[PDB]
Design a protein around this ligand. Sequence first.
Ligand SMILES: Cc1cc2nc3c(=O)[nH]c(=O)nc-3n(C[C@H](O)[C@H](O)[C@H](O)COP(=O)(O)O)c2cc1C
Ligand SMILES: Cc1cc2nc3c(=O)[nH]c(=O)nc-3n(C[C@H](O)[C@H](O)[C@H](O)COP(=O)(O)O)c2cc1C
Lengths: 176, 176
Amino acid sequence: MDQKQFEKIRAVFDRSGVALTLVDMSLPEQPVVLANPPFLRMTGYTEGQILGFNCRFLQRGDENAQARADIRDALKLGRELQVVLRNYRANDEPFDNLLFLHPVGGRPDAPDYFLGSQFELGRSGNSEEAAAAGHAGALTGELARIGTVAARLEMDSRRHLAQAAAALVRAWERRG
Amino acid sequence: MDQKQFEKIRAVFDRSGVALTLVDMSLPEQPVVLANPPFLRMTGYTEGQILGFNCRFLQRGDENAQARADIRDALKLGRELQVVLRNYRANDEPFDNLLFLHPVGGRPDAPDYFLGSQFELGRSGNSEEAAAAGHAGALTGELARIGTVAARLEMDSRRHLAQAAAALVRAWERRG
Ligand SMILES: Cc1cc2nc3c(=O)[nH]c(=O)nc-3n(C[C@H](O)[C@H](O)[C@H](O)COP(=O)(O)O)c2cc1C
Ligand SMILES: Cc1cc2nc3c(=O)[nH]c(=O)nc-3n(C[C@H](O)[C@H](O)[C@H](O)COP(=O)(O)O)c2cc1C
């Protein structure tokens, strides 16, 4: 709602150890309005190549059909979601992206923004499950700092998000 | 730095979503000098009952003989350590504590302080491994905030600490 919360999000984003993006849900094009350094490092793009545009261009011509259908549903309902996407860096190298989506601000059924956090798969040797759960932990800490996760709920939320990320890595590893 | 640096650590501690303690290694008894709200909640003690005392008050009898020997070695050598301890709340309720130890400040041969972060085991159902890795991820975020882990190293440090936590949980589950 408030500009004060927005400034807090910008500050948290700037210093975060995890990739973070913020998208404005009040516009149909759903443009990125914030994209932090770990995101740009992972994708290889500069800030100016991201802000004002939808994130989907990271997919190039890969349909990612079921994941996108799950995403559109979560965005419409204002619910959180974790899903694996096939993406490309600016230099056209492909990577697998475990994306965490969280509604931020506004009204519970209609958030003002969505936050996205990207965990790059395939870069943690044989400890992918632990690394993803680790990401979820660090992310839950940032959600608490921006006020999206209440303090009293952080420990339980961390457990749940970490377990959700590890489960998704297992399913993803079980196939292909 | 010095008192001023301490007060930033204090600020991180106060707001953290994970249990955190700080011990001054320059005082012979190695007393706890910072203990944050989630640590107090987990242990059932007030701040006043804790500060100025060695953290071994959480133990009883001569329990944890080998883990304590491992702890004394890590402390002496200035090494990180993860270890499981039988601890008790102020009401004597037992809990198992996955303790993360991290040197803070000073030089490799002589840290000024040690940080301890406590993850309570046995509260996560089937999610112990993921929940522990999640804690490691949150913790690594705080270690970067206080300057103990460099920003460009946070992602790698998170991966390895989460891997270590999960491995220790598996070991712990596969003993008994
Ligand atoms: C906050 C946020 C972050 C997103 N991050 C990514 C991303 O990193 N990679 C990606 O392929 N899609 C990402 N998306 C998804 C696309 O923006 C888009 O929502 C998705 O492709 C489904 O919509 P569509 O079927 O119209 O393309 C993100 C969406 C949101 C709201
Ligand atoms: C920063 C820090 C945090 C600690 N946290 C705990 C703890 O939560 N529970 C516990 O049983 N011991 C904890 N300890 C360990 C005890 O303080 C003590 O080092 C250990 O029992 C080994 O020494 P001892 O054999 O003389 O008791 C911590 C130590 C340090 C330095």
